[PDB]
A and B are shown apart, each in its own frame.
Chain A
Amino acid sequence: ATLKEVEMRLKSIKNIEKITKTMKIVASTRLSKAEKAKISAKKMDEAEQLFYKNAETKNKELIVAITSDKGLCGSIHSQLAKAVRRHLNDQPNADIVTIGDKIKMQLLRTHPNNIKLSINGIGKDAPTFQESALIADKLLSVMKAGTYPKISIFYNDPVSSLSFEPSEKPIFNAKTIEQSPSFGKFEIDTDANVPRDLFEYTLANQMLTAMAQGYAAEISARRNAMDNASKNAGDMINRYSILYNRTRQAVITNELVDIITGASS
């Protein structure tokens, strides 16, 4: 009817409301850990960056991208996809590793050949060294990424805990370390060639930090989005309520007419 279609769609809306509420709550719970993590990691990373600045480093081509397997957290998946697609116009022949099922899907549509190695089964957990290290290890062995002119990793910088701006940074390869001019004011011997360890070490350290930043933005966005979803659902509840009320009123009117029509006879 009017009544039943109003009501059933309102019921759908209700179930959705409850679910978006539920999601938002869990998102907040996860968020506290996520933000905390990102601090410790980021502080550690900055210490490494301290080397790179002073070294004056400054690096066919890698793209790495990070999201979760899990869906619904925002437009994290597709905003990141769009800035990647922009950088697939900045290098068509760049090899995409997609870390996370959702970011896998968006890029896989735009270029599927470019997807060469992809990583799944990461998104569930919060970023961890074990993951970063192994992904790095596979990235080196499988993709031989040291021979790729640069590496670029994309992640989501959590600009504010109400925003996320997708951001990228370049992982300085061993050649960069080699050819950086200040490196003698970071004296080291030929033996134990620092580029060949430092490349690999910062592959993980940069990746883990990137991962932390991304996940922190993602869970934060998930809370925000799920909250906004609940609000949007409220508006729809109210819209179907007015229709319900109008329909209810109309039933009464016809019934009153019926009583009068009867009584008059």
Chain B
Amino acid sequence: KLQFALPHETLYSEVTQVNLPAKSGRIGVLANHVPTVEQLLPGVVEVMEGSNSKKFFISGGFATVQPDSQLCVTAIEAPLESFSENIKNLLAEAKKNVSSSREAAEAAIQVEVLENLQSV
């Protein structure tokens, strides 16, 4: 079971297979999966409930398979695909803005996010 939730909307509060990107690389959870906490790395996420597959872009968060087999996914906001080239161009502008030093780090996260998005 999945319990994908945000302080914005409750997405997927059984959701058979969920594929997640975690700081442990990528983790997939299926039915009964062992109860873990994983910090979710900012992500391209696939959620499958039966055969149907839905494609979240997720702001990073926490994942917790609970021992009651509830995959509590908590993230600020998240499918990503409807949002989608000017964002890559302005992201190049933010990369040039990485010349300016926390602001560099912010802009770097922005560059990471563009790469992650651009893959889909």
Q: Do chains A and B make direct contact within the complex (CB under 8 angstroms)?
A: yes
B-contacting residues of A (Cβ < 8 Å)? 37, 40-41, 43-45, 47-48, 50-51, 54, 129, 183, 185-189, 192, 194, 197-198, 201, 205, 208-209, 212
Ordered by A's residue number, 12 sampled pairs between the chains whose C-beta atoms are within 8 Å are A40-B7, A40-B9, A43-B10, A44-B5, A47-B5, A187-B35, A188-B36, A189-B24, A198-B37, A198-B62, A205-B74, A212-B7
B13 contacts chain A at the CB level, 8 A cutoff? yes
Q: Which residues of A contact B16 (CB under 8 A)?
A: none
CB atoms of B67 and A47 under 8 A apart: no
* Tally of contact residues, B, Cβ under 8 A: 27
Contact string against A for B residues 22-47, beta-carbon threshold 8 Å, 1 for contact and 0 otherwise:
01100000000011111100000000
A-contacting residues of B (Cβ < 8 Å)? 3, 5-10, 13, 23-24, 34-39, 61-62, 64, 66-67, 70, 72-74, 76-77
Q: Which residues of A contact B36 (CB under 8 A)?
A: 186-188
Count: A-B pairs, CB below 8 Å: 76
Tell me the dominant secondary structure on chain A's binding face: helix
CB atoms of B76 and A129 under 8 A apart: yes
Q: Which residues of A contact B64 (CB under 8 A)?
A: 47, 50-51, 186
CB atoms of A48 and B62 under 8 A apart: yes
Q: Which 3 A-B pairs have the closest CB atoms?
A: A47-B72, A41-B7, A44-B5
- Taking A44-B5, A47-B74, A201-B62 as known contacts, 18 extra A-B pairs with beta carbons closer than 8 A to each other, sorted by chain A number, are A40-B7, A40-B10, A43-B5, A44-B6, A44-B7, A45-B7, A47-B72, A50-B66, A51-B37, A51-B66, A51-B72, A129-B7, A129-B77, A183-B37, A194-B39, A197-B39, A198-B39, A209-B7
Residue of B nearest to A53 (CB): B66
Name the contact of B61 in the complex, choosing from A189, A194, A201 (C-beta under 8 A).
A201
CB atoms of A54 and B61 under 8 A apart: no
What is the CB-to-nearest-CB distance from B8 to chain A, in angstroms, rounded to a whole number? 6
What is the CB-to-nearest-CB distance from B1 to chain A, in angstroms, rounded to a whole number? 12
Residue of A nearest to B9 (CB): A40
Q: Which residues of B contact A183 (CB under 8 A)?
A: 37
